[model samples]
Target: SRQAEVNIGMVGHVDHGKTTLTKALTGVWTDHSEELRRGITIKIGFADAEIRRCPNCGRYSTSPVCPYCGHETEFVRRVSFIDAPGHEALMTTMLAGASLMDGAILVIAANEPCPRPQTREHLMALQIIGQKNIIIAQNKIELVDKEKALENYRQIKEFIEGTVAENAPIIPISALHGANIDVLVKAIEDFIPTPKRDPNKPPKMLVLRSFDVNKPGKLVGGVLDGSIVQGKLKVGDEIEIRPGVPYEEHGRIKYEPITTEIVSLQAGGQFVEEAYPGGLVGVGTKLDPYLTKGDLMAGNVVGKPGKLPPVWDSLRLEVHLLERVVGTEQELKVEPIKRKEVLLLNVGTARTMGLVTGLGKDEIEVKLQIPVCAEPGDRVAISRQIGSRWRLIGYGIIKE
Candidate 1:
């Protein structure tokens, strides 16, 4: 099968069955032992599945043989599901996952009350990032009665009013029992279509996760996991990591770009000669294992040599402030960004602390603690520490 060509996010509150739903849709469990022990996801999980349509029944499914008609189904397209952590403390990680998502599935548990704190935050995160395609998975339907399920559906409908998911379809399902998953798959096919991409453009990928696949004394080293945001990437292609391998010299920190060849390309566990935009791709590079091990380069950007965006240690932002914080129990007023205040900025997949150095009417200058690779007009999610947790205040744009 070909590589997945679309990225869909599974997001919502903790214990809302997002992981199980991912398994139901993709037939691959996302949680490992660590997450199983914690009972909540701590990091992002990924699963890729090919969505197919049966010609006999005209039904959608992930299986090659249709469960309804038992006929061989035709291949539609493959999609990668990103299961983002729903814990409040891991909101930053979820925001990072949102950068790779082309569409989203907001999973709300039928047994719990609607609009949980992280649910609100995740929706706002999607909104802040300008995500449009969305579907509401009313999961755990088996745990709730018919009336209660309808009530929960009403709650979800009311909650999404006027938001980006206002018009999104809400599909009731039981991920644990694999009930109504076919309907959910159909909804995904209808609502979240693959985006148009240009392979002729410069190839750019955002590094979301990196791992050292080598064992002791092994020759093979680091592997990068991310999505190709633009253009395409192929085996044997020389790639560049921007703002990479930081070193201190004369009491000053500097970054040197790392250049390497693509030794391998894997998408959805299938080795491919080339991968286009969308889907989680594992890039095998010639860089040292220590450089890419343990997510050391998680937030770095990848591109063709000399074709990546500029590395900005200092940024000027055209800012916007929201009226109130989205995830807090008490309605907290979002104060304006003050000069010299430290703020966390999420640009693409990179997260860095930025010290506000200059402020204008609608513009501000900030010196980054760690440099990020980005371009002008890129959107930035801005946050500040409120009490102990980082609360999203608003967004900004990279300005010249």
Candidate 2:
């Protein structure tokens, strides 16, 4: 089976044509990406793309025919694209999905003004997550004239002046018509190079989505869907999930780790003998199908027994707060973290509430409502409840 070499995500404000841009590139949209319309649960959506380069004209595209030189493009490499929701309330989902992204495409609609609510929040989230590679797609160009598109481009340039996409090339494109898509592909190829990977480490994977795959009269089997953040996994390998299942014990939350064997491995919709870091991979496990139904295993970390990171019920972090709260229409100042104040903390795919037990000039001690399997130096997105809505305040780094 073919495997993707990198993971890239699409992010921006709502109605910015991010999904349309995704369809222009990959020709596929998942239920998760379309969930926004139905007001259902929001989750990260993903699609795989095989990048190709025209040997004669040096153009990049997803299709075989080069729109430029009338030549069939050569295979470059396969990559995964994660489509994150742009709604204000669903920012938590985006932050959780950031852990799996190697790069990002910040989509901005040319017809609308730059720096919309979620656009600002999304860029700040990318910065807090330490995403360095970014490309700005000034989409919906067909709706605006050349001068209007250029004005929007200028606005985009000024909006990202000091941010992660500061020097990112803003390619004017029409995702609806698929115009300049080849240019977008070329920019992605030039900007977001695949990161170096080491397959020697012990297998460490994150559970993005886990579900049961059995019918009424069929056999019982569970599948863990996610990508390996590090290392590799093969069939018949032993794996352990940290902070696996939660249950109430004496009115306190307790986690019981699960140990299971990998019954099979599949990548990019095909069964693979082994899997590596990159595209989404589904691991068929021996666990009971009922336990994995309805994304019960999402946000849990998996690895070899005794090799995974420790699960922390409480965390001390070096905190950094933004000057102002984003994703809101009003400019709200972010107040300091108070003792016993509950804040929403996103650690990798895990989202939990943390009570501030201790505070300092730059550090805060938090008692997590749910334990997270993460190591020191990991990043956490911190959000505070204001006016019955959770707004992103800043981010924190787990301290030793």
Candidate 3:
């Protein structure tokens, strides 16, 4: 069956009402932790919400799922919401969310006292990911005076100018109060066009998160938004896992393959005949005594060779700096890029440690500490450590 649905991701700082706004729209609280309810911010898995199933099809359908025919299908007129975490540690999760979105809802709290660090990082990440469809949710307006709220909105607008979300609509609302939520929803429906997943490609999903359940050896999984083609993974299909090696490491490591049958598949909030890309999915495998969290089998892709790119030592990238800084002397004074260096490398939900190897007109070369599978023209995001602030100074394209 053909797939149709707009996957939307929410981006913002912690406590900026992203989760609250998602709950307001979907009626499902994404923060499953009790600590979140007690006002403690924490890092958890990404939250995905699929629209209700079509009454006739019995399958979780998209917005325009056929009403008369009982054929299971996705709705062309619906939105799948991915609630990404606001913490910096979970920025990988946020990038994974943004990578799959048709557009984004950049949430900003009007009463946030000051813009948190991730507030800027998330927005910059979205821009680097090539997300053009955006709606600024000026949330928590009820907590601030009208003047202050307007000022905050203006600041957000200034920050977003010239990026993909430039001129994107900004809607003020209070997720806690249910104020103007409908307007925000309507804006998404109107501005963002529903994109069909590429039906001609092979089934390839970038694994975002993986965990082992307590029951024997079932593996829990998460993926960014995209569709699978060429092959279908069924309850009994044999699957393999290829782990990614960090740039700082050497040697092509291989692990013994564990053969397993697909016990079950869940996608977009419901069970399915088979799982595809383009939505978050959970796969239960029959293979036991072989899986663990953060294992190579956890984050690796499960597909045929060449379906995913092989690892590479260096990637040719075109980087655009936010502000021009000439000479190695000026660059060294900049803050240390966390984890690696300030010239951080982010591509398609994966962030790696890298250093500026060469600088040129309109582009820069980054010698990744480890190999990153990339192609020419792929967009890359760069962040620099400036004092206590890790700022997303610019982005670029992969040239080599």
Best model number under TM-score: 2
lDDT of 3 by residue, 284-389 (tens): 6654523534332333455544455455456655555553232245643434222224366665534555776665666556676544544456566566665565
Please provide, for model 1 over 1-400, each residue's C-alpha lDDT reduced to its tens digit, 9 standing for 90 to 100.
Answer: 3888777877776577876777778876554552421111124555678899999999898989898879999999888876645454345544444556789898898897757766777787777767889999999989989898898888888999989989999988988887788999999888998877667999999887777888755477578877788888999999999889989999999999999989889886678889886666889988898998778887788999989999999999999875543544554666677899999888777888999999998989999999999999888778888777676676788898
TM-score comparison, 1 vs 3, better candidate: 1
Please state the error at residue 359 of candidate 1 in Å: 2.0
lDDT of each: 0.80, 0.80, 0.56
Model 1 regions more than 4 Å off: 29-43, 54-56, 69-74, 87-99, 110-118, 151-155, 323-331
What C-alpha root-mean-square deviation, in Å, does candidate 2 show against the real structure? 3.3
